[PDB]
Structure formats: structure tokens, C-alpha cells
Write a protein that holds these residues in place. Structure first.
Motif, PDB file in Angstrom:
ATOM      1  N   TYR A   1     -71.968 -19.904 -15.546  1.00  0.00           N
ATOM      2  CA  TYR A   1     -72.061 -18.488 -15.406  1.00  0.00           C
ATOM      3  C   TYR A   1     -72.104 -18.094 -13.937  1.00  0.00           C
TER       4      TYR A   1
ATOM      5  N   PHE B   1     -67.588 -27.426 -25.513  1.00  0.00           N
ATOM      6  CA  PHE B   1     -68.471 -26.642 -26.378  1.00  0.00           C
ATOM      7  C   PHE B   1     -68.096 -26.830 -27.817  1.00  0.00           C
TER       8      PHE B   1
ATOM      9  N   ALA C   1     -77.362 -17.863 -32.381  1.00  0.00           N
ATOM     10  CA  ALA C   1     -76.149 -17.090 -32.614  1.00  0.00           C
ATOM     11  C   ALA C   1     -75.391 -17.594 -33.850  1.00  0.00           C
ATOM     12  N   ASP C   2     -75.449 -18.890 -34.110  1.00  0.00           N
ATOM     13  CA  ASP C   2     -74.816 -19.490 -35.284  1.00  0.00           C
ATOM     14  C   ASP C   2     -75.722 -19.490 -36.518  1.00  0.00           C
TER      15      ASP C   2
ATOM     16  N   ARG D   1     -80.958 -24.958 -18.170  1.00  0.00           N
ATOM     17  CA  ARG D   1     -80.369 -23.909 -17.327  1.00  0.00           C
ATOM     18  C   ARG D   1     -80.874 -24.123 -15.908  1.00  0.00           C
TER      19      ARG D   1
ATOM     20  N   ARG E   1     -71.540 -25.163 -19.467  1.00  0.00           N
ATOM     21  CA  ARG E   1     -71.148 -23.785 -19.450  1.00  0.00           C
ATOM     22  C   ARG E   1     -71.595 -23.162 -18.155  1.00  0.00           C
TER      23      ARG E   1
ATOM     24  N   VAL F   1     -75.391 -24.144 -17.438  1.00  0.00           N
ATOM     25  CA  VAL F   1     -76.051 -24.399 -18.724  1.00  0.00           C
ATOM     26  C   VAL F   1     -75.499 -25.722 -19.270  1.00  0.00           C
TER      27      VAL F   1
ATOM     28  N   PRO G   1     -69.855 -14.605 -23.177  1.00  0.00           N
ATOM     29  CA  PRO G   1     -71.094 -13.842 -23.183  1.00  0.00           C
ATOM     30  C   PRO G   1     -71.544 -13.410 -21.783  1.00  0.00           C
TER      31      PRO G   1
ATOM     32  N   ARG H   1     -78.886 -20.516 -37.139  1.00  0.00           N
ATOM     33  CA  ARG H   1     -79.965 -21.507 -37.434  1.00  0.00           C
ATOM     34  C   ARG H   1     -81.310 -20.815 -37.214  1.00  0.00           C
TER      35      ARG H   1
ATOM     36  N   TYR I   1     -69.833 -29.997 -28.922  1.00  0.00           N
ATOM     37  CA  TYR I   1     -71.262 -29.726 -29.040  1.00  0.00           C
ATOM     38  C   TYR I   1     -71.585 -29.004 -30.344  1.00  0.00           C
ATOM     39  N   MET I   2     -70.833 -27.927 -30.633  1.00  0.00           N
ATOM     40  CA  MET I   2     -71.050 -27.175 -31.862  1.00  0.00           C
ATOM     41  C   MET I   2     -70.853 -28.051 -33.084  1.00  0.00           C
TER      42      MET I   2
ATOM     43  N   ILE J   1     -81.166 -27.387 -24.299  1.00  0.00           N
ATOM     44  CA  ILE J   1     -80.355 -26.544 -23.438  1.00  0.00           C
ATOM     45  C   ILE J   1     -81.072 -26.443 -22.102  1.00  0.00           C
TER      46      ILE J   1
ATOM     47  N   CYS K   1     -75.847 -28.203 -22.491  1.00  0.00           N
ATOM     48  CA  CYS K   1     -76.236 -28.205 -23.902  1.00  0.00           C
ATOM     49  C   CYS K   1     -76.052 -29.602 -24.437  1.00  0.00           C
TER      50      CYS K   1
ATOM     51  N   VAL L   1     -72.222 -26.715 -36.713  1.00  0.00           N
ATOM     52  CA  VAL L   1     -71.591 -25.428 -36.855  1.00  0.00           C
ATOM     53  C   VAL L   1     -70.268 -25.593 -37.615  1.00  0.00           C
TER      54      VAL L   1
ATOM     55  N   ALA M   1     -66.982 -18.247 -32.130  1.00  0.00           N
ATOM     56  CA  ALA M   1     -67.961 -18.443 -31.079  1.00  0.00           C
ATOM     57  C   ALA M   1     -67.349 -19.023 -29.829  1.00  0.00           C
TER      58      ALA M   1
HETATM   59  C1  LIG Z   1     -76.220 -23.676 -26.601  1.00  0.00           C
HETATM   60  C2  LIG Z   1     -75.852 -22.824 -25.623  1.00  0.00           C
HETATM   61  C3  LIG Z   1     -76.374 -21.410 -25.488  1.00  0.00           C
HETATM   62  N1  LIG Z   1     -75.217 -20.466 -25.586  1.00  0.00           N
HETATM   63  C4  LIG Z   1     -74.306 -20.271 -24.590  1.00  0.00           C
HETATM   64  S1  LIG Z   1     -74.398 -20.868 -23.010  1.00  0.00           S
HETATM   65  N2  LIG Z   1     -73.395 -19.451 -25.088  1.00  0.00           N
HETATM   66  N3  LIG Z   1     -73.692 -19.183 -26.420  1.00  0.00           N
HETATM   67  C5  LIG Z   1     -74.826 -19.790 -26.707  1.00  0.00           C
HETATM   68  O1  LIG Z   1     -75.531 -19.688 -27.929  1.00  0.00           O
HETATM   69  C6  LIG Z   1     -75.776 -20.892 -28.660  1.00  0.00           C
HETATM   70  C7  LIG Z   1     -74.794 -21.253 -29.662  1.00  0.00           C
HETATM   71  C8  LIG Z   1     -73.640 -20.503 -29.828  1.00  0.00           C
HETATM   72  C9  LIG Z   1     -72.782 -20.885 -30.823  1.00  0.00           C
HETATM   73  C10 LIG Z   1     -73.017 -22.064 -31.567  1.00  0.00           C
HETATM   74  C11 LIG Z   1     -74.165 -22.816 -31.340  1.00  0.00           C
HETATM   75  C12 LIG Z   1     -75.036 -22.431 -30.352  1.00  0.00           C
END
Ligand SMILES: C=CCn1c(S)nnc1OCc1ccccc1
Length: 133
Positions: free
Chosen positions: A130, A18, A77-78, A108, A128, A117, A40, A80, A21-22, A106, A119, A27, A35
Motif C-alpha cells: 500500500y 494472494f 471480508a470473506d 503490517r 500486498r 502487508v 482496497p 469467516r 493465500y486465499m 497478517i 499474509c 476461500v 476479492a
Molecule cells: C489478509 C489480508 C488483509 N486484506 C488485504 S491486505 N486486503 N483484503 C484483505 O482482507 C482479508 C481477506 C480478503 C479476502 C479473502 C481473505 C482475506
């Protein structure tokens, strides 16, 4: 009855790649660190044609409601500001976010008792997982 198997309350149990990815999304450092700690809960519900996906965490709370195939505005959440469209493809929810000439997808899906999930940003994937809360 479209998304029955997605509905419920789900908690993050594992994450891979992750941070990368970020980074690929753009990010910044401090947001990535905070994050990345979060575990979550994702709450999915359906009322008629409207699907709602809520994320409750210690980082951010988010909520989206949408109709499949119908574009909407989303603040991620970040932070955008993206234009999103979510479709169902062969039982997989496919969520495309567009902003600043960029795109991320994304996916699912239900796999055994998990909700997985995936991404993707260009060549970088994060997975990710769950489980039911
Ligand atoms: C993309 C995945 C969706 N997701 C999951 S799963 N956990 N948190 C998510 O929010 C998206 C995000 C969080 C932080 C930075 C960039 C994107």
C-alpha cells in the motif's frame, strides 16, 4: 505515539500470491475472483489505546477496532467468523486470526513510504503493498 507511522489513508498498489493465500485459507472460487480484483483503501487511526483499521473496497467494507493484546471478534471480508488478537512486535503490527482450529497471521509494517502487508497461511505467503492515498 505507538502506531503514528501507520496512521493515514492507504491504497493498494501491488499484490503477489494472494489467490494462493486465499486458497490456503479456504476461500471459494467466486469470492477469490471478486476479492482478487479489489484495490482496497485501508484507513488507520488511533484514539487513545484504541486502533481502528477500516478497509473500503468494491468487494467488501470492513472495520475493526481493538486494543493491543486484547482478543476480539472479527468477521472477515470473506465471511469467516474469527477470534483475533493484534500486537505490536518490534514495530510490526501482528494480527492473528483463529477459526475452526485454523490460524492465519497478517503482518503490517512500514517500509520506506509504503505499508507492506504479509499474509501467511501455513507455507503460503502473500505480499500486498500500500501507498499513501
Ligand atoms: C489478509 C489480508 C488483509 N486484506 C488485504 S491486505 N486486503 N483484503 C484483505 O482482507 C482479508 C481477506 C480478503 C479476502 C479473502 C481473505 C482475506
Amino acid at each position: 505515539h505507538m502506531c503514528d507511522a501507520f496512521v493515514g489513508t492507504w491504497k493498494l498498489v501491488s499484490s503477489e500470491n494472494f489467490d494462493d493465500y486465499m486458497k490456503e485459507v479456504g476461500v471459494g472460487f467466486a469470492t477469490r475472483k471478486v476479492a482478487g480484483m479489489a484495490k482496497p483503501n485501508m484507513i488507520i487511526s488511533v484514539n487513545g489505546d484504541v486502533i481502528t483499521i477500516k478497509s473500503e473496497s468494491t468487494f467488501k467494507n470492513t472495520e475493526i477496532s481493538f486494543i493491543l493484546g486484547q482478543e476480539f471478534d472479527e468477521v472477515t471480508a470473506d465471511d469467516r467468523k474469527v477470534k483475533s488478537t493484534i500486537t505490536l512486535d518490534g514495530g510490526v503490527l501482528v494480527h492473528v486470526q483463529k477459526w475452526d482450529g485454523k490460524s492465519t497471521t497478517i503482518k503490517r509494517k512500514r517500509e520506506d513510504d509504503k505499508l507492506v502487508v504479509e499474509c501467511v497461511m501455513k507455507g503460503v505467503t502473500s505480499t500486498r503493498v500500500y501507498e499513501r492515498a
